Amino acid sequence: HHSQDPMLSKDIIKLLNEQVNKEMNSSNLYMSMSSWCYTHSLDGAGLFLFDHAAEEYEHAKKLIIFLNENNVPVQLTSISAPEHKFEGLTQIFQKAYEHEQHISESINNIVDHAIKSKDHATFNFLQWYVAEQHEEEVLFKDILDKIELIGNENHGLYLADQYVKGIAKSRKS
Amino acid sequence: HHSQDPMLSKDIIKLLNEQVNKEMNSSNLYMSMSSWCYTHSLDGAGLFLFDHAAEEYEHAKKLIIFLNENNVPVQLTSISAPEHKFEGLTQIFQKAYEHEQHISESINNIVDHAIKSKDHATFNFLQWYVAEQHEEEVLFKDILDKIELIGNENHGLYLADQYVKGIAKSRK
Amino acid sequence: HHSQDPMLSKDIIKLLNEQVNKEMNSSNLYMSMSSWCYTHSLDGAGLFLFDHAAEEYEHAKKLIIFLNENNVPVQLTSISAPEHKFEGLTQIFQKAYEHEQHISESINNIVDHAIKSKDHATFNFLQWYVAEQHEEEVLFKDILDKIELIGNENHGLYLADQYVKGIAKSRK
Amino acid sequence: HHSQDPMLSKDIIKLLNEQVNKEMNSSNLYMSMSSWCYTHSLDGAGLFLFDHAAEEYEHAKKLIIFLNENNVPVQLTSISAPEHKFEGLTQIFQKAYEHEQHISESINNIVDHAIKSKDHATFNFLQWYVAEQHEEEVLFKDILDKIELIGNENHGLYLADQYVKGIAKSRK
Amino acid sequence: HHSQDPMLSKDIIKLLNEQVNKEMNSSNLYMSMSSWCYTHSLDGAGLFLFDHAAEEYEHAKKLIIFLNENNVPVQLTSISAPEHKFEGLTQIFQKAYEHEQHISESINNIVDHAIKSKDHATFNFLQWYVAEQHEEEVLFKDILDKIELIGNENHGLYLADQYVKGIAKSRKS
Amino acid sequence: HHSQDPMLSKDIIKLLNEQVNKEMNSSNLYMSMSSWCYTHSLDGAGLFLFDHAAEEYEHAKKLIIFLNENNVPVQLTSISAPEHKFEGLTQIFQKAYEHEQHISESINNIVDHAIKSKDHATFNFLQWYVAEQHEEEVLFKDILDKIELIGNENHGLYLADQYVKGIAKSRK
Ligand SMILES: [Fe+3]
Ligand SMILES: [Fe+3]
Ligand SMILES: [Fe+3]
Ligand SMILES: [Fe+3]
Ligand SMILES: [Fe+3]
Ligand SMILES: [Fe+3]
Ligand SMILES: [Fe+3]
Ligand SMILES: [Fe+3]
Ligand SMILES: [Fe+3]
Ligand SMILES: [Fe+3]
Ligand SMILES: [Fe+3]
Ligand SMILES: [Fe+3]
Ligand SMILES: [Fe+3]
Ligand SMILES: [Fe+3]
């Protein structure tokens, strides 16, 4: 039996598949960052980063759904072993923030390519993703700022960890 | 500051970390099988397999949580790319069933090692996982049986795909 | 058309089929014990034992369901007439208590074999069964204790029957 | 202490005890047939026959209750193991339909003897049983008819098993 | 009149009785640790340890119920005077955590013996206990970690005590 | 940091700490009596005594709370093992009633010392305890009276055990 061809162009297909793989990669990175926090008495940051890892996987699934719907083969690559050694809470959120900036940038590139190729169905689909990613980028910016403001003298790490705990719990519900 | 050592033994740690990586790998395999179905007009199997991949990732997450709680470092390794070449619906479910068998065996192994080690916190923890995995293996056995019963004569693939669709919809 | 092979090992299959048959036999025994009580003015004990017979059959059915889901042929053997001659209430519950001990022993043996062969799906499945059987065994122990405490003298049989009647009714 | 004699006549007692054992044997037969279907990818027929087996045991229980109520000893006899080898779905339902006919005939025989011996208490009690057995016999005729109508060509077996599955589920 | 013999084997009987006595002993120890905290201005830790003492007694009662049900005589031994002198909050939770590890270990020994002797009714009964004890062990690990993270410079003891207070109140309801 | 001194006098502290240890001891005694009953077919008395031991521990806890609130160190001493040798139901309740009498006397002593010391915070606090203890002593007097009224002739022990069971059930 004959099935219909992919409904998206080859360039967009490639970019969307790469984005699926990026989100999968992010999910692993944040799981690893989470584990570091949990094994260093920072269960607030642990929980936040675990829940964030899970959310990145939710993004990957939403992208896959769109690919499936459009008759586009999903091409899952080898996911690389995440960084597992970190210096401290500040370095983790510095790295995480830099990571989210890169994700934001790669999204902008797909959206820009959708415009250039006049693929406005893909442009429209991506809007929820642009919005949620921007909110995520701002949140990491905000936590990094707060970690820097608190500092890690006496019980500063405890305070910073409880602040992050409060954010994680407030976002569950 | 001093953080408490891992609360689990080195052997158990190794086995549980390995299992996390196995579930991640299963999730990718099923998304790959799911996409093969969708791109070959089998959105019923496609749906079922997608939903099953997401469930494998849920098992991965619950394993991670248990490691985190026991102060055990989570050791995520490179996840090799899943196979993407399939001959048909029957082959996908034959591969899927053999896969669930291997996953069931790997779980039995950990549970047995927990018993050897007298680690009954881990034994107790793994019980939902043993249960849920058995349900999964049965389900794949049942679907495989049904695909084979229907066969691939005139509109047989359609009937099989509708059947799997019904199951996917009833489980969510 | 091709159906999948049984999902359990030969020895587990054998033990589990033997157990289905033990439960079927138990139901027969308890019906006959129940009838003896009913024809000897002991309707309270009759009711208790009738309801317990029915629950043995429920256990047989739950085992059969598990055999079905694992693609295991259920092999029912010949039924031999249950013992039908009894001496009195005390003897019936003595025999019953001893029978329940034997049922507990045979379950423990299946569970122990599940561990030895690392069949943790079966081990996990049998847990409700281990728990319910133990509750049944404790109950027969309790009733036998009470029958002895009360005695056979001067409306003692009436009081013991009313006691067992109360238990039967409260378990509905 | 003196207990009252059986309230039914010896011939009626005999026929009623025979009937209890026939229902026990029916339960066994249908469990075996059910298992056959389950192990040959016919879970729809499997479920139907399992549920029907359990209902035959319910019939046995209600007859036993009536014997208990009339101070009649229940005499459970030895029964051969049920047939376990079958040729296919059609053969199973042919055998089952022939079996339901025999049960129907056996009930009519008891009812007729109740009329002849002026045992109208027993006649009255058996009316629920006559009505339910008739409904069962009709159901088996209908399923057998539908199986032959569908046939065994390509996916006919699947369509037939799905039809029986819908009946099983709708009967609760 | 004749009563039925115990339904459990002599080895399991002995182990279960010893476990009842261990839980009773724990209850006293935690009452004593609680009193120390209350008399040293640490009412948060005071409350937590008091509620925990009470929970250990709940465990002992559940074990006794099972013994009673099985016609096994309950053999209560002399309960020894608990440690009453402690150095500080950190030492108390270090001791408590070490204590919970020992309890966890003794449970594993009973469960292991149940398997060896094929006593699967006892194996099954003990599962709630394995689960609750593991949760307790993890909780003490978590509090010890947090006490160490906070430290006791300036008002660190106050912060640590309020953290424990929050845990105690959240577990009541 | 400086923590405030105890808010109670040394004599009161001594008496209240002693009372905590007395309640702990009572709890163990009653669990011991409770187990004697259960192991001798008296699950009614067994239940009642178990429930009463748990209540003695509740009194211990409320005393501890009051000491904690007043910044008084709690001084738990070695709790001697309770007696385990009993001759029968009557002896257990004879011992139990004499025990509750001694506990009532010990409470009266503390309350009297509170009055001598003008410690009316403690006097006021102890009022629920005086009340609840009196109710307890009456109850044991009532049960002892009833056990003795029933006596131990043919099924008398059963009737007494059922009576105490009713009380236990009505109080929870
Ligand atoms: Fe993101
Ligand atoms: Fe993202
Ligand atoms: Fe699975
Ligand atoms: Fe799995
Ligand atoms: Fe067709
Ligand atoms: Fe039983
Ligand atoms: Fe049973
Ligand atoms: Fe019928
Ligand atoms: Fe019938
Ligand atoms: Fe504990
Ligand atoms: Fe504990
Ligand atoms: Fe008292
Ligand atoms: Fe008192
Ligand atoms: Fe009397």
From Swiss-Prot, chains B, C, D, F:
This protein's name: Bacterial non-heme ferritin
Stored InterPro entries: Ferritin (IPR001519), Ferritin-like (IPR012347), Ferritin-like_diiron (IPR009040), Ferritin-like_SF (IPR009078), Ferritin_DPS_dom (IPR008331), Ferritin_prok (IPR041719)
Catalytic class of the enzyme: oxidoreductase
Domain Ferritin-like diiron: residue ranges: 7-151
Single GO MF annotation: ferroxidase activity
GO terms for cellular component: cytosol
Top-level taxon: Bacteria
Enzyme Commission code(s) on record: 1.16.3.2
Gene3D superfamilies: 1.20.1260.10
Keywords: Cytoplasm, Iron, Iron storage, Metal-binding, Oxidoreductase
Binding of Fe cation 1, residues: E23, E56, H59
Catalytic activity: 4 Fe(2+) + O2 + 6 H2O = 4 iron(III) oxide-hydroxide + 12 H(+)
Subunit field text: Homooligomer of 24 subunits that assemble into a spherical protein shell (12 +/- 1 nM diameter) that can sequester at least 2000 iron atoms.
Main location: cytoplasm
Family: Belongs to the ferritin family. Prokaryotic subfamily.
Function: Iron-storage protein.
GO BP term (any one): iron ion transport
Binding-site residues for Fe cation 2, renumbered to this chain: E56, E100, Q133
